[PDB]
Ligand binder design. Structure first.
Ligand SMILES: CC(=O)N[C@H]1[C@H](O[C@H]2[C@@H](O)[C@@H](CO)O[C@@H](O[C@H]3[C@H](O)[C@@H](O)[C@H](O)O[C@@H]3CO)[C@@H]2O)O[C@H](CO)[C@@H](O)[C@@H]1O[C@@H]1O[C@H](CO)[C@H](O)[C@H](O)[C@H]1O[C@@H]1O[C@@H](C)[C@@H](O)[C@@H](O)[C@@H]1O
Length: 161
């Protein structure tokens, strides 16, 4: 099947040319991805209707507090990015979604994810010189979809499983 899964939470270096479609089941860290060279992204899930609150997360072994908020009726998935070991995280992208799926693809020297607000979320890329070595710790169930079937992945991100 085009939609391969769901797989249990795990750690691995995903193969290039496949979307990971990650199904978030609670608030907190959805995944932590890095090559320990030029790419770090952790995604943090915040449930609907959350007034500003200090929450603490473990990101790549380090405790980080963020004041988070979500005034919408949809879940929000915040990408926290840094591009070097010695740099501060920034909320680089956000996906606002009732479907509670995020996507990550390693392809052609870039990491691709979905951002924006469903059902109109789009893909966006980050460059890396060290793509293959990007590993991911995934804290919930996920699926694997070939890049050739990205249209299906897009459909799931935007309209749900
Ligand atoms: C236009 C396109 O193909 N966009 C898709 C994007 O493609 C880029 C990646 O392959 C990237 C490598 O990571 O390379 C980019 O190409 C580079 C060349 O490599 C470089 O030599 C040249 O100098 O510059 C170009 C441009 O920088 C590719 O453009 O890959 C994304 C991840 O798979 C994919 O999401 C994106 O697909 C589009 O996504 C948007 C939403 O953001 C819409 O759904 C579009 O409909 C969708 O494009 C459609 O699917 C793609 C795969 C392709 O078939 C399109 O023709 C089609 O409309």
């Amino acid at each position: 099947s085009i939609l391969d899964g769901p797989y249990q939470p795990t750690t691995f270096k995903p193969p290039n040319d496949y979307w990971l479609l990650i199904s978030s089941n609670t608030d907190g860290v959805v995944y932590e991805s890095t090559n320990n060279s030029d790419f770090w992204t952790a995604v943090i899930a915040v449930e609907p209707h959350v007034s500003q609150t200090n929450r603490q997360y473990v990101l790549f072994g380090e405790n980080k507090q963020f004041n988070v908020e979500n005034s919408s009726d949809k879940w929000k998935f915040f990408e926290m990015f840094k591009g070097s070991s010695q740099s501060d995280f920034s909320n680089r992208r956000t996906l606002t979604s009732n479907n509670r799926l995020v996507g990550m693809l390693k392809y052609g020297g870039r990491v691709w994810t979905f951002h924006g607000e469903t059902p109109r979320a789009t893909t966006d890329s980050s460059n890396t010189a060290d793509l293959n070595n990007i590993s991911i710790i995934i804290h919930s169930e996920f699926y694997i979809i070939p890049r050739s079937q990205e249209s299906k992945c897009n459909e799931y991100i935007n309209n749900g499983l």
